[PDB]
Design a protein around this nucleic acid. Structure first.
Ligand SMILES: [Mg+2]
Ligand SMILES: [Mg+2]
Ligand SMILES: [Mg+2]
Ligand SMILES: [Mg+2]
Ligand SMILES: [Mg+2]
Ligand SMILES: [Mg+2]
Ligand SMILES: [Mg+2]
Ligand SMILES: [Mg+2]
Ligand SMILES: [Mg+2]
Lengths: 120, 48, 114
RNA sequence: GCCUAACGAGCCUGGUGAUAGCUGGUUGUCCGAGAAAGAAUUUUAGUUCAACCUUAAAAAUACCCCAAAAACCCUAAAUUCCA
RNA sequence: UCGGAGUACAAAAAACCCUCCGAGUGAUUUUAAUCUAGACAAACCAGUCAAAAUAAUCACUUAUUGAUCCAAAAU
RNA sequence: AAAAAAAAAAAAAAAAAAAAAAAAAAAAAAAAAAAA
């Protein structure tokens, strides 16, 4: 029953959400965040984290993206947020890393496409 | 060239659409429209 | 003497385009904020965009104006290219309108004690 | 042309207080408050709406108004908006 | 009659037998729905946006349009 | 004989008409300048 910000719309991405999944792909490391419209970073999984760093090979791999995906899935359930929105780019949405990010997320149990607002 | 006013007929009931068509007839008029009575999506056929 | 002036139809009324509400104005949901033929001001938080490029307020609140960074929709190509050719240091800025919500979202009332 | 001292159509009595967005006139005294042209119109010699205004009434704020704020190439005097 | 500039330099408005360009429609496909808060604009008439609740685009895009009454039509 | 990969790890380069856009890190706090 809370507020989103319905608005902007000359700009991108759509800022209407409670929680926005954000995936930054550096030439080196894969980083995945979850954000509040306040800008605050709620739950994150990054490669430069020694945990994921030591457990696997070749950071830039599609495999490492699956990995960061389900690590953020796990950490999300622990944080009890089952709903967030993801706005990839038209070209990004076709890459393997992101499809596997989304599959890792779904198998994790986390639902994308945020539930609607009640009496908006 | 000219513009022809055509009256479309729904398959079911008394629902009737009114719309404009082209002299050259680029795309012959057959629609998928909204019928109020059955509250449905329908096939509307071009008529007079 | 033939007095023909060859020019015709200069005459239109003005469209009264411009800014309807001013910074720090109280607003009710649905008020038109400003109305423009080209984008002068873009819709910000809680401001909806009409098909004629009207800006109306979505919440009940206080209207605020802002200079912010402009990141065009990757679907809209012209703006994408305009963003592309810029020298590597510069970012684009625009003016936005906002509503700052006044009323809290709701209240919890005690209906019955059983 | 002429048809009884005015004929592009006689004179008289009716219709007839014909009808005039057009002139011209409209009568005692003393006090209050007081107006300059936005629209449409066979309309621009006129009307009918708005705005200002007069006479009563009900109320709550009204002018003035510092920051703050209103666009993109260049762009003065200045506006708009508010404690 | 209708719309873009200027004149009218920065909220709106703003004249001429002023200076210049346009429209009395094309091209598609995706057939672009109901019902109701709040609004812009406005003498009036006409014009405009639009949340919630149910289940059109491109052509500078802005202009492509005529009120009652009376007629023909079918629902 | 005067100051140590192109923060305390991170952020140009290299390999699916010609471009453009799915490997790497001073040595053992105490190797730039200015006197025949
Ligand atoms: Mg016709
Ligand atoms: Mg003009
Ligand atoms: Mg005018
Ligand atoms: Mg005589
Ligand atoms: Mg008289
Ligand atoms: Mg007339
Ligand atoms: Mg007159
Ligand atoms: Mg005030
Ligand atoms: Mg809706």
């Amino acid at each position: 029953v809370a507020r989103k910000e319905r608005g902007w719309g000359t700009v991108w991405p759509s800022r209407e959400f409670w929680h926005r999944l954000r995936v930054i792909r550096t030439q080196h490391h894969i980083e995945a965040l979850v954000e509040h419209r306040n800008g605050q970073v709620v739950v994150s999984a990054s490669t430069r984290e020694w945990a994921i760093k030591k457990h696997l090979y070749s950071t830039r791999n599609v495999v490492a993206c699956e990995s960061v995906g389900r690590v953020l899935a796990e950490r999300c359930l622990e944080a009890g947020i089952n709903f967030m929105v993801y706005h990839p780019t038209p070209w990004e949405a076709a890459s393997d890393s992101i499809k596997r990010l989304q599959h890792a997320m779904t198998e994790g149990g986390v639902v994308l496409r945020e539930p609607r607002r009640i009496y908006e | 060239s000219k513009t022809i006013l055509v009256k479309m007929m729904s398959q079911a009931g008394t629902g009737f659409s009114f719309n404009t068509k082209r002299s050259r007839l680029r795309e012959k008029l057959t629609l998928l429209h909204y019928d109020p009575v059955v509250k449905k999506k329908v096939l509307f056929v071009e008529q007079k | 003497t033939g007095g023909s002036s060859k020019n015709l139809g200069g005459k239109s009324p003005g469209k009264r385009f411009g800014i309807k509400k001013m910074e720090g104005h109280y607003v009710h949901a649905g008020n038109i904020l400003a109305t423009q033929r080209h984008f002068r001001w873009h819709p910000g938080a809680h401001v909806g965009l009409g098909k004629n490029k009207c800006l109306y307020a979505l919440e009940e609140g206080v209207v605020r104006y802002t200079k912010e960074v402009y990141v065009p929709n990757p679907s809209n190509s012209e703006a994408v290219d305009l963003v592309t050719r810029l020298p590597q240091g510069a970012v684009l800025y625009k003016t936005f309108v906002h509503v700052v919500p006044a009323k809290p979202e709701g209240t919890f009332k005690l209906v019955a004690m059983l």
